[PDB]
PDB file of C-alpha atoms (C1' of nucleotides) in Angstrom:
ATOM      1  CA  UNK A   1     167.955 248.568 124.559  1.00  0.00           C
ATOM      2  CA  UNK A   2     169.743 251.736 123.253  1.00  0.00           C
ATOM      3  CA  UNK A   3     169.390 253.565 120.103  1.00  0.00           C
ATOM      4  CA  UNK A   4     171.442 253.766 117.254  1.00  0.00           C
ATOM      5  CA  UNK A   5     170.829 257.559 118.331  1.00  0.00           C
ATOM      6  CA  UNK A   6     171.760 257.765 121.525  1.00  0.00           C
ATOM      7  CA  UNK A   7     174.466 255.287 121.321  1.00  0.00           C
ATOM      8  CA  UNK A   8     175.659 257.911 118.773  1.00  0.00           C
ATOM      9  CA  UNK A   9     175.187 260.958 121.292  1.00  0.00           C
ATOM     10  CA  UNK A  10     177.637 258.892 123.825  1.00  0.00           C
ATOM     11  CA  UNK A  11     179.881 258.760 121.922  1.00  0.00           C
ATOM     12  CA  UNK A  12     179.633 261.779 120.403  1.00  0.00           C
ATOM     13  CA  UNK A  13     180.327 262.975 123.921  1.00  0.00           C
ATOM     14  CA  UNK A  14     183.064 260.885 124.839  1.00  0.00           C
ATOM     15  CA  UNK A  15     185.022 261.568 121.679  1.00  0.00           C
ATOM     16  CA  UNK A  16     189.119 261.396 122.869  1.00  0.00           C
ATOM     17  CA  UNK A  17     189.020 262.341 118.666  1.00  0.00           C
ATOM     18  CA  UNK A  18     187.153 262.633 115.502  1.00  0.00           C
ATOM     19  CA  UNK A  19     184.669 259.756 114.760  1.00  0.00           C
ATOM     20  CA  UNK A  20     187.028 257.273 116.953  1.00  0.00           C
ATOM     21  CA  UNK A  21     184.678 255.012 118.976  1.00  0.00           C
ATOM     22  CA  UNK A  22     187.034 253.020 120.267  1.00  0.00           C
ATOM     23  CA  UNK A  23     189.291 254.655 123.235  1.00  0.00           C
ATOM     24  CA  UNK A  24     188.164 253.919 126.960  1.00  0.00           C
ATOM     25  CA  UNK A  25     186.513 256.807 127.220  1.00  0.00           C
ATOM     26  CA  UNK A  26     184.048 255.656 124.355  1.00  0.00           C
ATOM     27  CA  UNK A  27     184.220 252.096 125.649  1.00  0.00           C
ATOM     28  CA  UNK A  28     184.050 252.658 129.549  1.00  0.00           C
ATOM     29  CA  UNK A  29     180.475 255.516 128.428  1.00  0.00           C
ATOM     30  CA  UNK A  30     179.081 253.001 126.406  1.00  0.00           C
ATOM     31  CA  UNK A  31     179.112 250.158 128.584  1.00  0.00           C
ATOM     32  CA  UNK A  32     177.933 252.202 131.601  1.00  0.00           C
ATOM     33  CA  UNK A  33     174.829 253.349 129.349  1.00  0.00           C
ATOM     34  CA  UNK A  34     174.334 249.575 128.735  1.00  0.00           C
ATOM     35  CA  UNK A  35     174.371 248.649 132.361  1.00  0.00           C
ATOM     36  CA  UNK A  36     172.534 251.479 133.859  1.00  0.00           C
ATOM     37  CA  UNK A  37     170.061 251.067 131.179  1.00  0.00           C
ATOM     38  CA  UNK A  38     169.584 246.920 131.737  1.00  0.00           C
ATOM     39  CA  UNK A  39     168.922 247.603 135.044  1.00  0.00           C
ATOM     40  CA  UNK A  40     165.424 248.271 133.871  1.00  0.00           C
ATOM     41  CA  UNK A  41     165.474 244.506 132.317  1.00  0.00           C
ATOM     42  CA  UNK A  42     166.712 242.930 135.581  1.00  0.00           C
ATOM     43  CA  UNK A  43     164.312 244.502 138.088  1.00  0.00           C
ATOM     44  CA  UNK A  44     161.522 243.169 136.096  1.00  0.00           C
ATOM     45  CA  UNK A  45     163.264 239.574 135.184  1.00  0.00           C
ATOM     46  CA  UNK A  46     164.915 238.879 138.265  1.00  0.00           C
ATOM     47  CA  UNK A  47     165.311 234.855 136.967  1.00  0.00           C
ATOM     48  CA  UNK A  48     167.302 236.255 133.836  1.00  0.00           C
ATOM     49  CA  UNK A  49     170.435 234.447 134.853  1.00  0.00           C
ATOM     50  CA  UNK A  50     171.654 233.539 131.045  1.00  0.00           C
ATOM     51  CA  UNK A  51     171.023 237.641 129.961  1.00  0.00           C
ATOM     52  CA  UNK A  52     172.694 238.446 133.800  1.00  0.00           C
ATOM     53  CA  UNK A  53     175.844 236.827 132.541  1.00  0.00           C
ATOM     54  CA  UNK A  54     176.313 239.054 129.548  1.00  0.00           C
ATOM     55  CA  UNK A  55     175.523 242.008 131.675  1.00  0.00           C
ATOM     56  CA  UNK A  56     178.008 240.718 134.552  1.00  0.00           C
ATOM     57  CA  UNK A  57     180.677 240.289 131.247  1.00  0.00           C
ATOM     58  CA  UNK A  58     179.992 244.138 130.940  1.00  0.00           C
ATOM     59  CA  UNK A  59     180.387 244.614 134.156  1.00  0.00           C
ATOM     60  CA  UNK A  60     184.092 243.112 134.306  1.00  0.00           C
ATOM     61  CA  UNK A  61     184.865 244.405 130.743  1.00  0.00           C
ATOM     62  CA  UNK A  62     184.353 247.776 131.798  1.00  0.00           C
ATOM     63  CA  UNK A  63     186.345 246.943 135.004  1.00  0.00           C
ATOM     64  CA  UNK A  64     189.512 246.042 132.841  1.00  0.00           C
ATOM     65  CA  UNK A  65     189.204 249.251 130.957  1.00  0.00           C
ATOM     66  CA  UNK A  66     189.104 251.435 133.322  1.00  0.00           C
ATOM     67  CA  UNK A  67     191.970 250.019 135.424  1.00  0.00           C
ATOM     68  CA  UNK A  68     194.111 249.936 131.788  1.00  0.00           C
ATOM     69  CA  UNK A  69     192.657 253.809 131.962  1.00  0.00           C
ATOM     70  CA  UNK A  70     193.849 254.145 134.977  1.00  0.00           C
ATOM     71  CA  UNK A  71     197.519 252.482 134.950  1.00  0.00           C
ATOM     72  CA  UNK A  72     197.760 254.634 131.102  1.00  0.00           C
ATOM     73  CA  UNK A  73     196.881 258.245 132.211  1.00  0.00           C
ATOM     74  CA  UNK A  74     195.367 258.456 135.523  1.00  0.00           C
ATOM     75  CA  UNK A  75     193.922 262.262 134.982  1.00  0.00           C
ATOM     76  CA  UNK A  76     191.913 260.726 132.257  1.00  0.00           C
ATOM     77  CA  UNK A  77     190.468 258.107 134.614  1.00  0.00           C
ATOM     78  CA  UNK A  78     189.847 260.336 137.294  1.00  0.00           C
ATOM     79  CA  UNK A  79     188.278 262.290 134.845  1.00  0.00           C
ATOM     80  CA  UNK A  80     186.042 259.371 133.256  1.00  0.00           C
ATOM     81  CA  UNK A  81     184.845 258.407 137.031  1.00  0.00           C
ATOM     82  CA  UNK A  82     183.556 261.563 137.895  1.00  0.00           C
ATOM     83  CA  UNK A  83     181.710 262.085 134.835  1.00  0.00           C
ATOM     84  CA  UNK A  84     179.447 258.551 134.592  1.00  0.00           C
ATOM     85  CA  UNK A  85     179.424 258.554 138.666  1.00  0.00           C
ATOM     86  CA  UNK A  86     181.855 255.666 139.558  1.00  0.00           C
TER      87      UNK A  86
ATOM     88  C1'   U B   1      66.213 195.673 215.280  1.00  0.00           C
ATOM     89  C1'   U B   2      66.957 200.782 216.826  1.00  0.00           C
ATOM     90  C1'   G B   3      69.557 203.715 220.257  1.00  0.00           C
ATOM     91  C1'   C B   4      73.527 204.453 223.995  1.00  0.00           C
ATOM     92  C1'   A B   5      78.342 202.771 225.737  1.00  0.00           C
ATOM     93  C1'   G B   6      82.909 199.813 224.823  1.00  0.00           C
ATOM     94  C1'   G B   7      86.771 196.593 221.920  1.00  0.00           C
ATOM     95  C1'   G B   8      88.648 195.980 216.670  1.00  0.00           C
ATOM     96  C1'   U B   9      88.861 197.421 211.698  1.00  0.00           C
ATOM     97  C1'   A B  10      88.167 200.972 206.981  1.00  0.00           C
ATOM     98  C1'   U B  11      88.756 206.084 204.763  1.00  0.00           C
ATOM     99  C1'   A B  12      90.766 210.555 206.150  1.00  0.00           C
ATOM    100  C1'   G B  13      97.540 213.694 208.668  1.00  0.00           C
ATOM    101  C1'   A B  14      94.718 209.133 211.927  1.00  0.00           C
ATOM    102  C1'   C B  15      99.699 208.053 218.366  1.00  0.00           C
ATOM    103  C1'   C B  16     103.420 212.399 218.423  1.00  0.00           C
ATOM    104  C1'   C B  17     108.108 214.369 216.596  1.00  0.00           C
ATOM    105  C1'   G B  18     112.013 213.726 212.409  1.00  0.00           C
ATOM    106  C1'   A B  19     114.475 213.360 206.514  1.00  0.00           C
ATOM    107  C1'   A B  20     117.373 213.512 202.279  1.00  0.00           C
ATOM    108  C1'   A B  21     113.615 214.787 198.292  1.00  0.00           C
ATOM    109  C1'   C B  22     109.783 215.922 194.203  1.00  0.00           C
ATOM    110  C1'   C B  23     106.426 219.816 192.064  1.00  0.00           C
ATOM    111  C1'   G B  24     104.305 224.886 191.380  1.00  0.00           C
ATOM    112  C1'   A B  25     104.631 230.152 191.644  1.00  0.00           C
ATOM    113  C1'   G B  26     107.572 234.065 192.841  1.00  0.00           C
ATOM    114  C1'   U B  27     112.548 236.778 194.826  1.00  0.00           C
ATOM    115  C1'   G B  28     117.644 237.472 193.909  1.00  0.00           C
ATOM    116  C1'   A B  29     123.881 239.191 189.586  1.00  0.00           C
ATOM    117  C1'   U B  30     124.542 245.488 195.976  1.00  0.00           C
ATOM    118  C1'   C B  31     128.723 238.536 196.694  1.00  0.00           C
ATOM    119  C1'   U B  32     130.485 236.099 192.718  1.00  0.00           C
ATOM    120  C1'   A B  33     130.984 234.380 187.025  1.00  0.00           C
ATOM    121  C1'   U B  34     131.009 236.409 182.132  1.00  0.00           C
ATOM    122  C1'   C B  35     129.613 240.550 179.195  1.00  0.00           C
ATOM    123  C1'   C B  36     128.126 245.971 177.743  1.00  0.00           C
ATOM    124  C1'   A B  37     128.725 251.338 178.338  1.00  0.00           C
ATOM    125  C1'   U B  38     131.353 255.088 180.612  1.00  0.00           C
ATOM    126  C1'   G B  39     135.373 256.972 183.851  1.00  0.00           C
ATOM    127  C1'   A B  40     140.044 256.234 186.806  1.00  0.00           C
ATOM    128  C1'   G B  41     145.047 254.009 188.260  1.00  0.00           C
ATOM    129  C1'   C B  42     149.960 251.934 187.528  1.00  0.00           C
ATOM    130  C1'   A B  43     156.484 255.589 192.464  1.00  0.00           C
ATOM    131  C1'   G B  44     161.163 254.680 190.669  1.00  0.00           C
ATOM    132  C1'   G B  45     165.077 252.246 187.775  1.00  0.00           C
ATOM    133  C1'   U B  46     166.405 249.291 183.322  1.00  0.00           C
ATOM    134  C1'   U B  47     167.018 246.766 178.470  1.00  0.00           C
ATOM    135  C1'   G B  48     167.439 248.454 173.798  1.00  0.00           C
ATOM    136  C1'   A B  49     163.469 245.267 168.347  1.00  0.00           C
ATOM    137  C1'   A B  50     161.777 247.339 163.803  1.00  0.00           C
ATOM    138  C1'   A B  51     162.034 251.648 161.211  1.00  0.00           C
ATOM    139  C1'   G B  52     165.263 255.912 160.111  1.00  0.00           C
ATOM    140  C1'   U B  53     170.024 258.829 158.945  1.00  0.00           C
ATOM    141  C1'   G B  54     175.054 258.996 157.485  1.00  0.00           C
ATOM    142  C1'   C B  55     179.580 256.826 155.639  1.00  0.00           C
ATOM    143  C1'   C B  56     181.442 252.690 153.136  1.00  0.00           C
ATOM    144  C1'   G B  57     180.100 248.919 149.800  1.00  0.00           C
ATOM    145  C1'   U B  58     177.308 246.307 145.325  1.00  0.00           C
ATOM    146  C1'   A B  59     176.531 246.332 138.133  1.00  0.00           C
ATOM    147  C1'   A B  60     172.239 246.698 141.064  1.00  0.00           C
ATOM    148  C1'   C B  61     169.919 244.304 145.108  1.00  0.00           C
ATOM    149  C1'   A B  62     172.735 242.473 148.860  1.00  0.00           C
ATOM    150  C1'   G B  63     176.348 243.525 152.948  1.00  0.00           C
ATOM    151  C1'   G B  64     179.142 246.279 156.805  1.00  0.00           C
ATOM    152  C1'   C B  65     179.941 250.138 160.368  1.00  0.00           C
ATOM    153  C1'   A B  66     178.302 254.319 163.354  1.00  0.00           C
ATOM    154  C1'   C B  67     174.568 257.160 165.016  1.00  0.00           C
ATOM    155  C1'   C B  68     169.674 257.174 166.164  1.00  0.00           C
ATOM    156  C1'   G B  69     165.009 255.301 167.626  1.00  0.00           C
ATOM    157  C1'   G B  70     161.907 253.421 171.554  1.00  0.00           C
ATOM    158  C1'   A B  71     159.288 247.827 170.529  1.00  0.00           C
ATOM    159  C1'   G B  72     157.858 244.269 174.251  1.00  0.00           C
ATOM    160  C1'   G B  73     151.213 239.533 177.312  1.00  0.00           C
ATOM    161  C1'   A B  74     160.337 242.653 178.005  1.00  0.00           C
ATOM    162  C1'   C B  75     163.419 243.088 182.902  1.00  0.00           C
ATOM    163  C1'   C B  76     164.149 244.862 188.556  1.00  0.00           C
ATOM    164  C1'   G B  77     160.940 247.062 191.954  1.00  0.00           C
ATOM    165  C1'   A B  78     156.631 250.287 195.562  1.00  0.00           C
ATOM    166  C1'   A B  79     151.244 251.507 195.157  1.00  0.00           C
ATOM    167  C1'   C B  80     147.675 248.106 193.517  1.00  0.00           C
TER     168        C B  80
END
RNA sequence: UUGCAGGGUAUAGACCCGAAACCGAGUGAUCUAUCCAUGAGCAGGUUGAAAGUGCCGUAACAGGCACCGGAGGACCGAAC
């Protein structure tokens, strides 16, 4: 998985504001770590179909916020891409 | 009966010539069959597999496109 710590050091990064955790920044970093970091899981456990739809519902939840992101301020979103490589 | 001569017969090549064979011991792989070692040859012209690289793409594999590469008891065709 992902530590309490590091899941804290995302979002400390991402931070639009103090202690928020909840903007699309925040969001969008989070479930990127997730992802990225699961691809360890699925490489291993190619037959995890029932933990490859939760990932897949990352996957498309991460999709909506960043085209919300995207249609809201578009700087931000170009911004957000660049950083986490999308 | 013993010689000598003659006719026949017996055993021997047994009136002469003639097999295809069978057996024994050698000679041959400078032809040819396969193999072993060690050398040599195959003008010229084609096609364009895998791999690779880049860009795109995918959550990631996948996938696409271009370039590139030079496979093959591959193709056309002399020597052979």
């Amino acid at each position: 998985m992902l530590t309490n710590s590091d899941r804290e050091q995302i979002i400390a990064q991402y931070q639009r504001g103090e202690n928020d955790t909840g903007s699309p920044e925040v969001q969008v970093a989070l479930l990127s770590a997730r992802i990225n970091d699961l691809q360890n899981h699925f490489k291993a456990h190619k037959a995890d179909h029932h933990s490859r739809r939760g990932l897949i519902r990352m996957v498309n939840t991460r999709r909506k916020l960043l085209d919300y992101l995207k249609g809201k301020d578009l700087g931000r979103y170009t911004t957000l891409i660049s950083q986490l490589g999308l």
